[PDB]
Design an enzyme around this catalytic site. Structure first.
Site, PDB file in Angstrom:
ATOM      1  N   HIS A  62       0.874  -1.182   0.000  1.00 26.53           N
ATOM      2  CA  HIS A  62       0.000   0.000   0.000  1.00 26.53           C
ATOM      3  C   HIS A  62       0.905   1.224   0.000  1.00 26.53           C
ATOM      4  O   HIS A  62       2.128   1.121  -0.087  1.00 26.53           O
ATOM      5  CB  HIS A  62      -1.072   0.000   1.114  1.00 26.53           C
ATOM      6  CG  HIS A  62      -0.573   0.113   2.501  1.00 26.53           C
ATOM      7  ND1 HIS A  62      -0.118  -0.962   3.227  1.00 26.53           N
ATOM      8  CD2 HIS A  62      -0.550   1.172   3.345  1.00 26.53           C
ATOM      9  CE1 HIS A  62       0.208  -0.550   4.443  1.00 26.53           C
ATOM     10  NE2 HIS A  62      -0.047   0.739   4.540  1.00 26.53           N
TER      11      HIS A  62
ATOM     12  N   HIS B  78       1.622   3.819   2.138  1.00 29.31           N
ATOM     13  CA  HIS B  78       2.273   4.451   3.274  1.00 29.31           C
ATOM     14  C   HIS B  78       3.792   4.268   3.227  1.00 29.31           C
ATOM     15  O   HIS B  78       4.333   3.355   2.582  1.00 29.31           O
ATOM     16  CB  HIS B  78       1.701   3.914   4.583  1.00 29.31           C
ATOM     17  CG  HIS B  78       0.313   4.367   4.888  1.00 29.31           C
ATOM     18  ND1 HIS B  78      -0.536   3.659   5.705  1.00 29.31           N
ATOM     19  CD2 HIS B  78      -0.336   5.511   4.571  1.00 29.31           C
ATOM     20  CE1 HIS B  78      -1.664   4.326   5.855  1.00 29.31           C
ATOM     21  NE2 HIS B  78      -1.572   5.452   5.173  1.00 29.31           N
TER      22      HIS B  78
ATOM     23  N   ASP C  33       5.944   3.116   5.289  1.00 27.97           N
ATOM     24  CA  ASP C  33       6.489   1.828   5.715  1.00 27.97           C
ATOM     25  C   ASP C  33       6.456   0.779   4.601  1.00 27.97           C
ATOM     26  O   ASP C  33       6.986  -0.318   4.789  1.00 27.97           O
ATOM     27  CB  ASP C  33       5.827   1.326   7.000  1.00 27.97           C
ATOM     28  CG  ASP C  33       4.304   1.133   6.931  1.00 27.97           C
ATOM     29  OD1 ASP C  33       3.621   1.969   6.292  1.00 27.97           O
ATOM     30  OD2 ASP C  33       3.806   0.169   7.591  1.00 27.97           O
TER      31      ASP C  33
ATOM     32  N   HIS D 119      -7.049  -1.676   6.306  1.00 25.66           N
ATOM     33  CA  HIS D 119      -6.113  -0.678   6.814  1.00 25.66           C
ATOM     34  C   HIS D 119      -6.021   0.530   5.893  1.00 25.66           C
ATOM     35  O   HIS D 119      -5.853   1.658   6.356  1.00 25.66           O
ATOM     36  CB  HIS D 119      -4.758  -1.343   7.001  1.00 25.66           C
ATOM     37  CG  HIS D 119      -3.662  -0.381   7.216  1.00 25.66           C
ATOM     38  ND1 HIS D 119      -3.404   0.195   8.436  1.00 25.66           N
ATOM     39  CD2 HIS D 119      -2.769   0.148   6.354  1.00 25.66           C
ATOM     40  CE1 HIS D 119      -2.378   1.022   8.312  1.00 25.66           C
ATOM     41  NE2 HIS D 119      -1.981   1.016   7.054  1.00 25.66           N
TER      42      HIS D 119
ATOM     43  N   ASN E 163      -2.398   2.410  13.108  1.00 26.59           N
ATOM     44  CA  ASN E 163      -2.629   3.721  12.510  1.00 26.59           C
ATOM     45  C   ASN E 163      -3.785   3.601  11.529  1.00 26.59           C
ATOM     46  O   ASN E 163      -3.639   3.031  10.445  1.00 26.59           O
ATOM     47  CB  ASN E 163      -1.351   4.248  11.880  1.00 26.59           C
ATOM     48  CG  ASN E 163      -1.509   5.647  11.371  1.00 26.59           C
ATOM     49  OD1 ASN E 163      -2.624   6.134  11.160  1.00 26.59           O
ATOM     50  ND2 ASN E 163      -0.389   6.341  11.192  1.00 26.59           N
TER      51      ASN E 163
HETATM   52  C1  XN6 Z   1       1.346   5.709   8.254  1.00 24.79           C
HETATM   53  C2  XN6 Z   1       2.487   4.763   8.594  1.00 24.79           C
HETATM   54  C3  XN6 Z   1       3.833   5.173   8.007  1.00 24.79           C
HETATM   55  C4  XN6 Z   1       2.563   4.548  10.115  1.00 24.79           C
HETATM   56  C5  XN6 Z   1       3.238   5.437  10.955  1.00 24.79           C
HETATM   57  C6  XN6 Z   1       3.306   5.214  12.345  1.00 24.79           C
HETATM   58  C7  XN6 Z   1       2.703   4.106  12.926  1.00 24.79           C
HETATM   59  C8  XN6 Z   1       2.001   3.186  12.102  1.00 24.79           C
HETATM   60  C9  XN6 Z   1       1.270   2.004  12.366  1.00 24.79           C
HETATM   61  C10 XN6 Z   1       1.100   1.315  13.677  1.00 24.79           C
HETATM   62  C11 XN6 Z   1       0.854   2.012  14.846  1.00 24.79           C
HETATM   63  C12 XN6 Z   1       0.751   1.345  16.054  1.00 24.79           C
HETATM   64  C13 XN6 Z   1       0.862  -0.033  16.132  1.00 24.79           C
HETATM   65  C14 XN6 Z   1       0.743  -0.774  17.506  1.00 24.79           C
HETATM   66  N1  XN6 Z   1       1.948  -1.565  17.677  1.00 24.79           N
HETATM   67  C15 XN6 Z   1       3.199  -0.984  18.071  1.00 24.79           C
HETATM   68  N2  XN6 Z   1       4.258  -1.677  18.077  1.00 24.79           N
HETATM   69  N3  XN6 Z   1       3.181   0.385  18.462  1.00 24.79           N
HETATM   70  C16 XN6 Z   1       1.120  -0.715  14.953  1.00 24.79           C
HETATM   71  F1  XN6 Z   1       1.209  -2.075  14.977  1.00 24.79           F
HETATM   72  C17 XN6 Z   1       1.242  -0.066  13.742  1.00 24.79           C
HETATM   73  C18 XN6 Z   1       0.829   1.571  11.129  1.00 24.79           C
HETATM   74  C19 XN6 Z   1      -0.086   0.441  10.807  1.00 24.79           C
HETATM   75  O1  XN6 Z   1      -1.053   0.226  11.612  1.00 24.79           O
HETATM   76  O2  XN6 Z   1       0.022  -0.165   9.715  1.00 24.79           O
HETATM   77  N4  XN6 Z   1       1.240   2.407  10.171  1.00 24.79           N
HETATM   78  C20 XN6 Z   1       1.966   3.417  10.715  1.00 24.79           C
HETATM   79 ZN    ZN Z   2       1.718  -0.300   8.440  1.00 20.02          ZN
HETATM   80 ZN    ZN Z   3      -0.241   1.729   6.330  1.00 20.01          ZN
END
Ligand code: XN6
Ligand code: ZN
Ligand code: ZN
Length: 232
Positions: free
Chosen positions: A85, A87, A89, A150, A181
């Site tokens: 996707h 984002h 990451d 998501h 998120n």
């Molecule tokens: C938009 C993208 C680049 C992004 C930024 C920051 C955080 C996230 C998260 C996230 C947030 C908290 C958790 C809870 N687990 C923990 N280890 N904090 C988790 F698994 C993913 C996701 C996701 O949800 O894809 N994507 C993110």
């Molecule tokens: Zn993610």
């Molecule tokens: Zn994402």
């Protein structure tokens, strides 16, 4: 030394690999976002004497470190990458990949969303994935569009030789309390999209979330549960 590596075990900028099955690895990296540190996963699948990469390591320097770790631990060239996707990451690091000669791919929906977000944009569009339930082959994997979850564009990846289901960020780890998120999520459709995954891949033996520890098929129902509890 063996167990799956967790967020406090990986400094931002280093990358770990974890053998999931024969010819299947996950990659794990950590990144700062809004003042907190998070782990994230991707996938590596052996494709003859080449490798297919699923998702970047969340940033340019992390992705360069990923390529170096692959060279050290596997020693086969990464020739293609798919981002699941839009984002950062998933696509942050695509420019590093593209300059290392890796051909980068994503759905047209992901490419449009990445462009509009100001994120890095995979080069090649993956057609045949625009309707929920669609599936296409890509080297040693199947790509599946389960519907909005998501994000509206999220893809999942199945490795049929190993019965490995890479859920990406549509799937959460078992220890998760929260839906992660959700800024771009569809909480109402997410359970229906998970049900589609469950129906399509009932023989999955390993399920890998976008963030956190792999497990079995229970990650799918757990994800639906955490999303429904969030929406409410
Ligand atoms: C938009 C993208 C680049 C992004 C930024 C920051 C955080 C996230 C998260 C996230 C947030 C908290 C958790 C809870 N687990 C923990 N280890 N904090 C988790 F698994 C993913 C996701 C996701 O949800 O894809 N994507 C993110
Ligand atoms: Zn993610
Ligand atoms: Zn994402």
């Amino acid at each position: 030394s063996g167990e799956y590596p967790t967020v406090n075990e990986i400094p931002v900028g280093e990358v770990r690999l974890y053998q999931i099955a024969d010819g299947v690895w996950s990659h794990i990296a950590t990144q700062s976002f809004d003042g907190a540190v998070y782990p994230s996963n991707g996938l590596i699948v052996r494709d003859g004497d080449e490798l297919l990469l699923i998702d970047t390591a969340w940033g340019a320097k992390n992705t360069a470190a990923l390529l170096a770790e692959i060279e050290k631990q596997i020693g086969l060239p990464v020739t293609r990458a798919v981002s699941t996707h839009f984002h950062d990451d998933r696509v942050g690091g695509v420019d590093v990949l593209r300059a290392a000669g890796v051909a980068t791919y994503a759905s047209p929906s992901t490419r449009r969303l990445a462009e509009a977000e100001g994120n890095e944009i995979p080069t090649h569009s993956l057609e045949g994935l625009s309707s929920s339930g669609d599936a296409v082959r890509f080297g040693p994997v199947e790509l599946f569009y389960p519907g909005a979850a998501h994000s509206t564009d999220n893809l999942v990846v199945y490795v049929p030789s190993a019965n490995v289901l890479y859920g990406g960020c549509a799937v959460h780890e078992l220890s998760s309390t929260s839906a992660g998120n959700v800024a771009d999520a569809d909480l109402a459709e997410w359970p229906t999209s998970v049900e589609r995954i469950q129906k399509h891949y009932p023989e999955a033996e390993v399920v890998i979330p976008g963030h956190g520890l792999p497990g079995g098929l229970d990650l799918l129902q757990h994800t639906a549960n955490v999303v429904k509890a969030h929406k409410n």
